[PDB]
Assembly symmetry: D2
Homo-oligomer: 436 residues x 4
Amino acid sequence: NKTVIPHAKGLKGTIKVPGDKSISHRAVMFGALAKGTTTVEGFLPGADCLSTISCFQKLGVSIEQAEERVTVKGKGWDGLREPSDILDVGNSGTTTRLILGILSTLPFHSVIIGDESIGKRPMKRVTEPLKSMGAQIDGRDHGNLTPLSIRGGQLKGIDFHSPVASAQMKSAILLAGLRAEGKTSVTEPAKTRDHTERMLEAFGVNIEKDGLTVSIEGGQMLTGQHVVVPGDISSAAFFLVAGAMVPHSRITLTNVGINPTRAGILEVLKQMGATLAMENERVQGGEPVADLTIETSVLQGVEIGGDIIPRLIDEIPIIAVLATQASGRTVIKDAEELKVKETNRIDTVVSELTKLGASIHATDDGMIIEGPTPLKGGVTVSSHGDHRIGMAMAIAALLAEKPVTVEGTEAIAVSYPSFFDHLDRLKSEAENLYFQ
Amino acid sequence: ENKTVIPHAKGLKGTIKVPGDKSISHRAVMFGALAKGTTTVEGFLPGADCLSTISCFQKLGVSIEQAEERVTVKGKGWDGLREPSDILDVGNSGTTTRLILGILSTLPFHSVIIGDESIGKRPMKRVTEPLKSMGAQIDGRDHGNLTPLSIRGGQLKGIDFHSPVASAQMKSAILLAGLRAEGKTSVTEPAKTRDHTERMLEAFGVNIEKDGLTVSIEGGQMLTGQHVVVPGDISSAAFFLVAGAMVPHSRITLTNVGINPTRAGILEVLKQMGATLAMENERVQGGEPVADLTIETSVLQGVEIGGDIIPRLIDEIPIIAVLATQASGRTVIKDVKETNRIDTVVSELTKLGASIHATDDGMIIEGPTPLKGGVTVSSHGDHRIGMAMAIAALLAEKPVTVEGTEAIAVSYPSFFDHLDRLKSEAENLYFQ
Amino acid sequence: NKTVIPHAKGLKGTIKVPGDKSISHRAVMFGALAKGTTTVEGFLPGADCLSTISCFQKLGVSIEQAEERVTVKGKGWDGLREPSDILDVGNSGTTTRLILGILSTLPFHSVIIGDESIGKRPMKRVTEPLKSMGAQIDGRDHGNLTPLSIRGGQLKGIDFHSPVASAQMKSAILLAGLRAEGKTSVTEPAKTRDHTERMLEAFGVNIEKDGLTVSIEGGQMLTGQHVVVPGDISSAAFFLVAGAMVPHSRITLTNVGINPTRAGILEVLKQMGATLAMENERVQGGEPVADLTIETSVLQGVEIGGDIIPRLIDEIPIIAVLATQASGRTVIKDAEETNRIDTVVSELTKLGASIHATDDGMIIEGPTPLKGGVTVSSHGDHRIGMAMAIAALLAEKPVTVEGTEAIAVSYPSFFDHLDRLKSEAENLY
Amino acid sequence: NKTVIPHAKGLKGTIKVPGDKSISHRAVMFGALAKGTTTVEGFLPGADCLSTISCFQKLGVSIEQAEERVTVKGKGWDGLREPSDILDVGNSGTTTRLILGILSTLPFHSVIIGDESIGKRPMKRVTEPLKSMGAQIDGRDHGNLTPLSIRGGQLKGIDFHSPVASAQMKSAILLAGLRAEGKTSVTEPAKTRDHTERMLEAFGVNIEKDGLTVSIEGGQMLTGQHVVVPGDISSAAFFLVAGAMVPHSRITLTNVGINPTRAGILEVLKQMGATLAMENERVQGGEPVADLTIETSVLQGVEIGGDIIPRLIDEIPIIAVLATQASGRTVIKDAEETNRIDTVVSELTKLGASIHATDDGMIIEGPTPLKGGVTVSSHGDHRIGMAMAIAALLAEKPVTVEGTEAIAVSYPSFFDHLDRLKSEAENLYFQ
């Protein structure tokens, strides 16, 4: 249904956001390929990550997952049996592409299928480079579409130049070369998420990191690990921006992932002039982690573009909200080179936030967000089934004088169950904090 | 409680429609999907297997509409089979697996097949190797031998195939794959085998050539929509034929039964034994021989069963065994699972008080023997042994308990209902 | 949803129609109440009868059912135990009404509920009389609607007179009478379905009957019977009317129930001068059964009214079709489901027939050839869909029959049996 | 199944434990009888508490619920309609007893049923008093077992005396006495959970207590409240105890409810001397809530019985573990089900601890370092498995715990919260 949302008198307390999706996926896949038991804490246990588990369980690996905790009794490649079942990818694009790399590594036959939606997402960009490595891959629309059949094994390294930049593709090819013979090299136009690169090293593998081109030597051995999964930045960002905007706020998000390739918001917040702080910075993967603390801030407009855009793409709608309370003008530029799935978000956020009373319009390559503007409520705003719009809108409502009806909150409860619960106990602690 | 108590029958009178033929039901649907025009199946077997065949072809883009025993298959040639976005689920059906493979090899896109646990243990390599020799890219578990299998069907070149094994499912696959290949495709085997695929395909407007031991198809001909009235499955029909032959005061008409000689082996044994049997209304529906059989309490003579016949009556050996117990003198049947069948058939009938004995390649039955109840007989989860025992219990003085009845209820749900119906009609006609 | 139906060149063959729904219900119920095993052949395995089985199992009766054969390890009243589960009736009007009577006998607590459909049908007509007999019954809308709660036990016989004519009602009270103290008597306006009467006798209970008045004494035993369920004339009727009208037809329907309170269709056929044979009359458990043979006849219009209407109600839609091919005026009157008559009229009329409704029924006229090429709906009522289907067998140009799911649910093999009849005619000719 | 647990290096952090079961049940129930909307926060979305929601949804009440957040559109008693469905109570004893009360209020027919479990639990101790009030209740075993049928309405108050202490039974009769005529009274040999009284007071109803006897006039009006459900002391107990035992530990437990009728372990903590802070002392929806803070403390053995025992019954397993590390003769004594305590002893001595069993309670002696390397079962009981789990955080070498799949039911994230305290002391440890 809908949620009606009042304005917040304040936000205070500590919160653990649910663990990073990308890291949780990889923590599992890598543990399966490794020798000796891997354990996973802070595991994001959603449909996609549960799909990954199910897939490897069918490949023979003994995995026990109990809420946020996972234990993977890996025995290396030598203990992955040929599946007598179809591997069901569910809704996970991550699982599909990375496991396509891994299955090309294996000297047996496998079939991949997922749901309605995954059968419209093109896979050709990944099957082609893998056929090049010596992998027999056929499927719907000549291997472009689900379902896909795969026999791998005796695989050969490859240098590979790529036109479009994509982290999932990279990760597939890297995992495939992990059991190949010789140099396997990936090259892209943009730099992009390094989770595969980082986590591999924490498992006991060496990668190249050469400028714009990453490479791997097969065949190295993966060992069992103890993986503490960092919080998802994308989920933290909702609270960070709330903490910044909402009067009388002081929020501490613990164990948040700080991977420079995804923590672009943390740079935006800082340059806008947020009272932001990091604490206890570590490297738990692989991945850098910190405890973020924000409190009510006086913000300023900031021009955002270039190499920053690729590193904060999920935080565009929430930054749109944040900019509403910043003095002067903020600009998003170089969004022209974004998927229609993201160009649509921008367009709706623009109109949703306008319904809420802000000065904001769409541009050729992003949006301009103008002035500090008090948001007025007494209106319905829709999440359009996109959890990122719902959530951003949800926190935008915390500033609105008069009630705001956010509809389509179903999509939020799917992705991030306790979003409103966490929000509610920040409002409770702040009300319990004002006493005589 | 998985056991029925079966009392001796005082008589058996009536008419019965046994369930459709499984082989013909499958193919009606399949060849339907390959033809131009509306095929209409009547008396179709709505079992799990045949329902699986329907499903796979729906998943291939073919419009198919099924109620109870009535099927409609709409259009539309090869030109209307679209590349599946779903896994084609074969379920339990060996037939769907094997025949559809032949057909899938004929199509220029990608298909996957899987089934349940059972099908995932049955070796397919016997079919996949031939089709690969025709040009088909077929991979699968255990190097294309076990489910799940993946199929890409390129431009297909014909083949002169030779096989050490006699297999009708294997033959069907290659003939079907030969349908849209170029240049004559031929299968040769040791024994002559079931000929449903050739007959029906022939009735669907296709031409098969037959030079004894070798069958061949010239690609690529058209198939036309047909009205297929599925004939009664003889294996089921056999159980009534035998009961009717034996129990005093019996007379059973069985309407519209597939009479095909590659499976009608029991019809020739009945004749040989001097059973009172009648064929009436024999015609041919959509390639398949069919007539209504009528049988009455007979005076049977022992006979030798062996050679060519065995293939064409294999499934009836258990019931034939019972038929034999009532024939005068010796009746021999000669020529892993077949031997396990034979043994328990022998075992059971023996405690019913028959003189039957097992041999290396079959069994020997002696004389006319009154069967006796008061014993519990088991089917070891074999519907064929179950039913055959059921019928034998109809002869025994004292009651006979037949454990393992749920196997029957799965193959032939209305089997005991049909028996009961004949038992009652005989008591109602006994108004002297 | 639909079926397209062409005219029939002929209909030849034998059919076993499904068990009578009413007898099938009762043989389970009486089996459960009786000492000794009861066995049931020809049982109708539809959703309703299975609900009946479901319920008595929850009362603790061992019942093993497969296709059309039931076994009931009946062990008497002593043998029914207090349910820990809710008794679920699904969609079954019979089960609900009758079980209410039975449960008013049993000295413990029980709860009845059904689906949405039963949850709308009123129960006051049965609950009120049983309450006056001594049973504690409460429920939604002051015991008028499910869920109903019942504590039965020590009942005292009533002399019941009703303004309604209902066999479920009569059966409830008669069943409560079985263990009630003294004499329970039901007097009804019309006479009605007497299956409850005939089967109590077949199970060994002395039931006294004047006309319209039936009485019963507690507390007689019931003995396990072997029950052969007769065919529903309700279904047989579609095939009898089919045989009567379609040229080149010769149909035999085996083991069909001819109970006179329900054989109204036969009276009409015979009065219309149909070529009807009733062979092998028997009585199976107090139930008159016979083999019927019909062949293409030259029917005449007849006047259907008065005492017969009650005996042929469910068959009015099919008789309406029958009258379409009869030579002359045929009147149905003294009827008062009055919307059910009207759809029959509407559809048949757009089929080319010459029907009209009256206030007391309808008037159908002459032998009218029927023109297809048009679409007619069952309106979820299965009987309209089957009447319409066999009407279709007679019509030049095809007829689409909307809502064949309803048919398919209540008579799965109905269209297959038709096919089989048309098939066999092709072979002869 | 089973989970392997090594020793704890140290426990540091802030934790919000799940909502209180009893308050979650009541928030919905009372909200359904109230006039005007009732919003609940901190709701425990367990099986039992969702069963309450189910039941009132079938009584006509519009209720939205999503994870820990619940909205109840109350329209007073007049808004409850006669049910067309059976009221399904699932496995919930609370729901069963407290609804029998509420339904007795209602001038229509209603049927209750639950699982094989509820089906075996006696109800005569609740239905008999309710009938005295004018309620008509029939059911299996002469009103003593599920399913039960009820028609209510015209109710007259009763002076009721119970020979058995039961919160549920008290709650039922009070709830019925909310729409009865005159003064309804309940008197029982001991005093037990008083959540019904507090909540009702908070929803605007006058409950008069004269120690031992509670009484209510009717009909008073219930008004829609904002109800922040406090954390469950029974589940906070497992973290207070672990904190007091593990070397270098300092844990804050946000918004835990401090009801004296269940805060027995807190009295035991301060009597054992353990360092225990108590910030933010406030009363919320009639319930007293506080923020608890425990650090690693020196434990002293203490005598426990009679006065303070009835109000800590569930915590006995966990307190038995807390005594393992307390110096000296620490004994609990009262038998008044108690089969739980029998099993605790077997497993603990198996770990290498000093516990014998006595006529009513048990003896615990000295501070004993526990040894690990054995399998301990909980027999499907969650209160053991949890106590047994946190116990294993002291002994080294794997201490395999069984019945863990029963823990994941009453407390989904128990082992997660636990894990998060170990690994946040990995990150607090940097010079």
